[PDB]
């Protein structure tokens, strides 16, 4: 049973995503996170290669190998909830709190972080998973290894090439075609959220709060940002989805060159 395999520690967070606790796997003292989701709150259901929440399906699809995505270790069904056991980086801070405390990040640091988010999102898409809630709050930084982890697949979907008409991610990271038409395509919408993230990193906060700003097409820079970085941001936040870069184009952008290794990032910017 769940209760004789994991020792439960403090609550790490709770909200729309459910309740997440720190834990330790009793057998080898491995650090884990234990996420609880109420059944009445699970909207999207899948079937496993058993009927489980879509989140479990998506996590299993991305859990193979080493990546910048959080790894599902196990899961349990209860009468009124599902419990997910995830790996837990330590020591860790989420990217939201990191930017709050440090302010606008040096571009070298934003380049390393953003590069790693790109690789993690490429991994997801390669595995047929669309995250749908890319934001600083959903990124953990392993402060010792300089490695980033994408968390909270609870808003995600199977990746398809047709239009999505549903969305329960974060509105301020959502693209103008969603705001205006309640329709988006997966990859192009992901690139928009990525531009919002990169702005957030180099400026200290997201560019837009209001629907009218999102749809407006104007990126005001509140911090000194290099012309190459401003250009990438603005390309990612092109109002027309087809004007947005592919993942390849992002990673081939001049601003993205000479990225730091994770360990160099940790040594220079985190230790």
């Amino acid at each position: 049973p769940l209760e004789s395999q994991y020792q439960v520690g403090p609550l790490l967070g709770s909200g729309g995503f459910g309740s997440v606790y720190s834990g330790i796997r009793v057998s080898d003292n491995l650090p884990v996170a234990i996420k609880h989701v109420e059944k009445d709150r699970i909207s999207d259901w899948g079937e496993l290669p058993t009927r489980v929440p879509m989140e479990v399906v998506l996590l299993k699809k991305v859990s193979s190998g080493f990546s910048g995505v959080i790894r599902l270790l196990d899961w349990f069904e209860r009468p009124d909830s599902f419990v997910l056991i995830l790996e837990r980086p330590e020591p860790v801070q989420d990217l939201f709190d990191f930017i709050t405390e440090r302010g606008a990040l040096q571009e070298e640091l934003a380049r390393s972080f953003f590069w790693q988010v790109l690789e993690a999102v490429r991994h997801c898409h390669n595995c047929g998973v669309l995250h749908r809630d890319i934001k600083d709050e959903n990124i953990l930084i392993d402060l010792n290894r300089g490695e980033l982890k994408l968390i909270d697949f609870g808003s995600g979907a199977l990746l398809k090439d047709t239009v999505y008409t549903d969305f329960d991610g974060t509105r301020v990271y959502s693209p103008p075609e969603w705001i205006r038409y309640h329709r988006y395509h997966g990859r192009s919408a992901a690139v928009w959220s990525l531009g919002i993230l990169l702005y957030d990193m180099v400026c200290g906060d997201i560019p837009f709060e209001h629907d009218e700003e999102i749809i407006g097409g104007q990126v005001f820079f509140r911090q000194r940002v290099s012309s190459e970085c401003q250009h990438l941001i603005r390309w990612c936040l092109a109002l027309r989805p087809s004007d947005r870069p592919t993942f390849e184009e992002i990673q081939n952008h001049p601003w993205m060159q000479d990225v730091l290794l994770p360990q160099e990032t940790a040594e220079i910017h985190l230790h």
């Binding site: 729309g16 995503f17 709050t100 934001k135 709050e137 329960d168 974060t170 301020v172 990271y173």
Partner: peptide, 8 residues
């Protein structure tokens, strides 16, 4: 200026 979290 006020920075805030945003629920999903």
């Amino acid at each position: 200026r006020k920075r805030r979290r945003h629920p999903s």
